[PDB]
Amino acid sequence: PEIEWWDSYIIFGITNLVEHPAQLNPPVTLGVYLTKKEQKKLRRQTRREAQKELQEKVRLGLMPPPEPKPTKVEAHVRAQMAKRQKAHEEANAARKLTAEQRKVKKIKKLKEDISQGVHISVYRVRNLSNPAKKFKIEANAGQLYLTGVVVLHKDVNVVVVEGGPKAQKKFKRLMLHRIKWDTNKCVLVWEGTAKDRSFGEMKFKQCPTENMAREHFKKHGAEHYWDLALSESVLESTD
Amino acid sequence: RKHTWMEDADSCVAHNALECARAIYAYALQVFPSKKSVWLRAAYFEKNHRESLEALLQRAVAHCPKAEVLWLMGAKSKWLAGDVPAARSILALAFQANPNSEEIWLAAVKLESENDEYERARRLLAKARSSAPTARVFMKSVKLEWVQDNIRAAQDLCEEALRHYEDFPKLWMMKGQIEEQKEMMEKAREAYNQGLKKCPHSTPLWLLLSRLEEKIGQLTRARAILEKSRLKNPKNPGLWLESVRLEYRAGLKNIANTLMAKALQECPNSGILWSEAIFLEARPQRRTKSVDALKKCEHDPHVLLAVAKLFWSQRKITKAREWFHRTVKIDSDLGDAWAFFYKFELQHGTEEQQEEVRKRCESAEPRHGELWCAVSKDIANWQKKIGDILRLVAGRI
Amino acid sequence: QTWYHEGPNSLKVARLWIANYSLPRAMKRLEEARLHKEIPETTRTSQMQELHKSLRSLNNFCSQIGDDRPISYCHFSPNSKMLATACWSGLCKLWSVPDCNLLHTLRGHNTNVGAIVFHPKSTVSLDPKDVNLASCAADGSVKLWSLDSDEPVADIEGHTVRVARVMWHPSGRFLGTTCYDRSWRLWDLEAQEEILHQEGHSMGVYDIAFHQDGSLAGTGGLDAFGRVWDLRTGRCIMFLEGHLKEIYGINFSPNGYHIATGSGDNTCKVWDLRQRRCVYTIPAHQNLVTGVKFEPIHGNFLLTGAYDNTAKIWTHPGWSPLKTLAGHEGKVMGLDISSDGQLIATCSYDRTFKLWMAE
Amino acid sequence: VNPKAYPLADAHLTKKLLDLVQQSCNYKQLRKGANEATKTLNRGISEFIVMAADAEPLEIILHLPLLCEDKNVPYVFVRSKQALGRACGVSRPVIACSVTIKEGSQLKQQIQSIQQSIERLLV
């Protein structure tokens, strides 16, 4: 390179002009807590207006008042306490998270808000050709809404995981403590954050030699995880 | 039934009586000549409860061959009780009994090295150095030419020993200590450094390189050696306590206290670091730092030694004596727990209490104490008896 | 929306001075790089394997406590004999290195000191009496020091909030200063007047690093966007982003290509300047990356600090992890490599500063 | 705010902080008060210290950063003492809280994540 391009821009381009360039945005709500006495007071006043509005609806006369509580009399009250326990099971029967409201609330528990930046684990394992452990990795990456890849190679196979931080902590609890591996160990190679998510979903790509695995990573703009895990693997193998 | 008799004999010897235990041992070993453990239990019982040592070990040398622990128990019993000049003969019959060269040979050099005429203790080890021994043998050989005076041959034997046995770190410790007692001292740095780059997860060798580079000046390099040690192991109390003591031996008491806090962060249930942390606090605050130490690591001998040293430090002798008794009974194998105990009982107590604290130390002979192994590895104080060792640690406090 | 503002003519004469100082430096650097390219690749690759055999044998020696407060920054002097540390108390100690004896602590700060930076002509071309050091603090404070006074010489009062870092121009006549005004100032030593107050970030600016030929000055701050300013034109030359978290360290390479911005998202990112790209995003550490420093004059490797307890050596170019300089018990706050390449120091939150060397 | 209050937690971090302090109040892992935070720092049983930047004067808790550097404990400043006090389950303002270690309690993962996050704030 003959002269680097700012030097070619000036050789004259200077005078007494300092400038304010193109400000770019960097790439809130607070919960309310109550003391226990305030919980008692809020509960008791909500209940006092609840009793007041139930007695109000009795005062309007929409309905007779609710159920107040030798074989014949407590047989009546047995049918009425069956009615009472049945109404408790009715109020538990509705408001039940029927079959898929559990599913959408488990989803909104597990699917975080990743824009605001995605936390990335990179692991290397010496060998995960075991079917059960590659199933645990694939299924728990899909189920924790974690994205990424497991490229497969001899002596260093790379698990790039990419999701929200509460899922990343569960995946490192899985990968480092829950999956019992054994000379075969799994380490945490990297645990960082990138701007937004790179991979598609947890797909076990594979090539037995290193250059095509780096090419598959370079397709995603993520070759640095491969070069890092490969280089620290071969440095552990030499040391 | 043999396991039942051994359990009932242990319970009877613990609770009430001894002669019923002698009778059940005579019966249970007249049922069969047995494994090494039952003769061993009879011999240990009689070593707790003098002529019957010779009787039972003679029956063991008759009816139980290849139980060499009974052979060495017999040889030590004929050393202490009767005297020397036949037990070697008895060990010579062990020479007639076992050509396996593992433990009887360095027992023999213990025998002829306690006494005069160590040149015989040369030539025998010569035999052992070609016989069939784990170069454990060699370190006794390296102690051989170290206790009289180190020759250049004393540097030669450890070098040939490491040329055989690079992996063993106590040989590197002996090479470094020998080079420390030579004239200059970076040869000992070379020895410790090569050992620590080859052994490498052995904490007393890191402690030796630390104390060496602290002693010659450049305390910063000693802090670097200890910090390499705390990384390369990691998470052990023995290097954390030496780092704390390195800052406390210099003027940096605040940095010693924050390294003690960092140490108790990552290894809370450890005796030595809490026993140092009680000492590091200001004296009105040791009273509850010690209570937290008892709650983290209860039934630890270093911690109860620290509580006894606290009660003696606050001059409450009636509680310090009880806590020292608890210290020595939780673990009597710790040497400093007898050091402070005899120094306290010579500071406070009748003459028969000093009698007591030198009864029970020679009863169960200790190890593992850093003052105790600080004089038990002084080669000027190496082959001397254990009351002399307890007096030497009690005078150096 | 690039807004322009008229400055004083002190800025104009300073920019023509920076031009006529930087252009011969850039010509000489490019010609020496052209002479370094024309020698055969056997000698060059054998020299880099020589250097990597040395750099994998970087062992720690002379780790020394700085204060009862965690040290925030070290900067090797030229002549590489002193080492200015910056504690989180007011003190800015100066250790005689590699011996690590203390030499005349600098008192005169109150809140947490950020960087203390030696002059580029401190030992070599600057007398001890003349200004030699420049510290900065967590209040509005930048203040120059001599090597023999222990209480400063004339401070800088253009600041009102926390100044994060300070760096000199490779001249020494200029003193870049990231403030938390979402801006960085550029003080001058001949005129003794703040010539430039560049606002170009949306959030506060953390670290400034000047090009070793003197022409450029990269910044980068809590807005996660690093800038590359020319001193001569204002005119942010290569806006660089891809970090999402707060960029905590810039350094320019002695070969004029690269800028390694280390950020709060545990990456480091090596950017070109002749490509305007992000050449390689080093997945550096487990926690955030504060100190990023290339080697001096030859510039063959890249040392990253960390808020895990490590600091790592990456080859340059290639970015493979030559050696983790681990061993600290706290977060590595700042570092510097000596100007001969032989010595490497990292301060930390462990209250220590160390030295790593070839064995 | 006060410039000596350092590090200062932003809005997302202080929301996580006050929810963790609320959970520790529920799990009985929380010691409210500058004297109780000083005590649990001295006893070494503190996971982390939160403090209040709107404590006037600030220096009645500014000894607690120094204790958090001599005990290796993460410390962080919340914006105001009223929100921190309500986050401890008391209606009074609380200027310094100590979330403390307990025997394998279920907040240890949240406490570890918040420890790693507020040791990034002092930079």
Swiss-Prot record, chain A:
Highest rank taxon of the organism: Eukaryota
Signal peptide segment: none
Ranges for region Mediates interaction with SART3: 16-127
Location in or out of the cell: Nucleus; Nucleus speckle
Record note on modification: Ubiquitinated. Undergoes 'Lys-63'-linked polyubiquitination by PRPF19 and deubiquitination by USP4. 'Lys-63'-linked ubiquitination increases the affinity for PRPF8 and may regulate the assembly of the U4/U6-U5 tri-snRNP complex.
Tissue expression remark: Highly expressed in retina, liver, kidney and blood. Detected at lower levels in heart and brain.
Functional summary from the UniProt entry: Plays a role in pre-mRNA splicing as component of the U4/U6-U5 tri-snRNP complex that is involved in spliceosome assembly, and as component of the precatalytic spliceosome (spliceosome B complex).
Disease: Retinitis pigmentosa 18: A retinal dystrophy belonging to the group of pigmentary retinopathies. Retinitis pigmentosa is characterized by retinal pigment deposits visible on fundus examination and primary loss of rod photoreceptor cells followed by secondary loss of cone photoreceptors. Patients typically have night vision blindness and loss of midperipheral visual field. As their condition progresses, they lose their far peripheral visual field and eventually central vision as well.
The protein's name: U4/U6 small nuclear ribonucleoprotein Prp3
Organism, as annotated: Homo sapiens (Human)
Gene transcribed to yield this protein: PRPF3
Shown residues within the full chain: 385 to 683 of 683
Curated annotation (Swiss-Prot), chain B:
First and last residues of every HAT repeat: 16-48, 50-80, 82-114, 149-181, 183-215, 315-347
Tissue: Widely expressed.
Record's comment on post-translational modification: Phosphorylated by PRP4K during spliceosome assembly.
Cellular compartments annotated: Nucleus, Nucleoplasm; Nucleus speckle
Subunit structure: Identified in the spliceosome B complex. Identified in the spliceosome C complex. Associates with the U5 snRNP particle. Component of the U4/U6-U5 tri-snRNP complex composed of the U4, U6 and U5 snRNAs and at least PRPF3, PRPF4, PRPF6, PRPF8, PRPF31, SNRNP200, TXNL4A, SNRNP40, DDX23, CD2BP2, PPIH, SNU13, EFTUD2, SART1 and USP39, LSm proteins LSm2-8 and Sm proteins. Interacts with ARAF. Interacts with AR and NR3C1, but not ESR1, independently of the presence of hormones. Interacts with USH1G.
Disease: Retinitis pigmentosa 60: A retinal dystrophy belonging to the group of pigmentary retinopathies. Retinitis pigmentosa is characterized by retinal pigment deposits visible on fundus examination and primary loss of rod photoreceptor cells followed by secondary loss of cone photoreceptors. Patients typically have night vision blindness and loss of midperipheral visual field. As their condition progresses, they lose their far peripheral visual field and eventually central vision as well.
Name the UniProt record assigns to this protein: Pre-mRNA-processing factor 6
Source organism: Homo sapiens (Human)
Gene label: PRPF6
Span within the parent record: 539 to 937 of 941
Curated annotation (Swiss-Prot), chain C:
Keyword Nucleus included in the entry's annotation: yes
Keyword Chloroplast on entry: no
GO cellular component: Cajal body; nuclear speck; nucleoplasm; nucleus; spliceosomal complex; spliceosomal snRNP complex; U2-type precatalytic spliceosome; U4/U6 snRNP
Annotated localization: Nucleus; Nucleus speckle
Main location (coarse class): nucleus
Ranges of the WD repeats in the UniProt entry: 66-105, 108-155, 158-197, 200-239, 242-281, 284-324, 327-358
Organism domain of life: Eukaryota
Keywords, alphabetical: Acetylation, Disease variant, mRNA processing, mRNA splicing, Nucleus, Repeat, Retinitis pigmentosa, Spliceosome, WD repeat
Effect of R29K: Decreases PRPF3 binding
GO MF, one annotated term: U4 snRNA binding
GO biological process, one term: RNA processing
Protein's job: Plays a role in pre-mRNA splicing as component of the U4/U6-U5 tri-snRNP complex that is involved in spliceosome assembly, and as component of the precatalytic spliceosome (spliceosome B complex).
Disease linked to the protein: Retinitis pigmentosa 70: A retinal dystrophy belonging to the group of pigmentary retinopathies. Retinitis pigmentosa is characterized by retinal pigment deposits visible on fundus examination and primary loss of rod photoreceptor cells followed by secondary loss of cone photoreceptors. Patients typically have night vision blindness and loss of midperipheral visual field. As their condition progresses, they lose their far peripheral visual field and eventually central vision as well.
Protein name: U4/U6 small nuclear ribonucleoprotein Prp4
Gene: PRPF4
Curated annotation (Swiss-Prot), chain D:
Transmembrane segments: none
Chain segments carrying region Important for U4 snRNA-binding: 91-123
Main location: nucleus
GO BP term, example: box C/D snoRNP assembly
Site keyed Interaction with U4 snRNA and U4atac snRNA: positions: E56, K81
Interaction with U4 snRNA and U4atac snRNA: annotated segments: 31-43
PROSITE patterns: RIBOSOMAL_L7AE (PS01082)
Functional note: Part of the small subunit (SSU) processome, first precursor of the small eukaryotic ribosomal subunit. During the assembly of the SSU processome in the nucleolus, many ribosome biogenesis factors, an RNA chaperone and ribosomal proteins associate with the nascent pre-rRNA and work in concert to generate RNA folding, modifications, rearrangements and cleavage as well as targeted degradation of pre-ribosomal RNA by the RNA exosome. Involved in pre-mRNA splicing as component of the spliceosome. Binds to the 5'-stem-loop of U4 snRNA and thereby contributes to spliceosome assembly.
Gene3D superfamilies associated with the record: 3.30.1330.30
Subcellular location: Nucleus; Nucleus, Nucleolus
Name under which the protein is recorded: NHP2-like protein 1
Disulfide bond residue pairs: none
UniProt tissue specificity: Ubiquitous.
Key words, A-Z: Acetylation, mRNA processing, mRNA splicing, Nucleus, Phosphoprotein, Ribonucleoprotein, RNA-binding, Spliceosome
Modified residues (Phosphoserine): S117
UniProt cross-references to CDD domains, sorted A to Z: SNU13
MF-aspect GO terms: ATPase binding; box C/D sno(s)RNA binding; RNA binding; U3 snoRNA binding; U4 snRNA binding; U4atac snRNA binding
PTM sites of type N6-acetyllysine: K16
Protein family membership: Belongs to the eukaryotic ribosomal protein eL8 family.
Phylogenetic lineage: Eukaryota, Metazoa, Chordata, Craniata, Vertebrata
Pfam families: Ribosomal_L7Ae
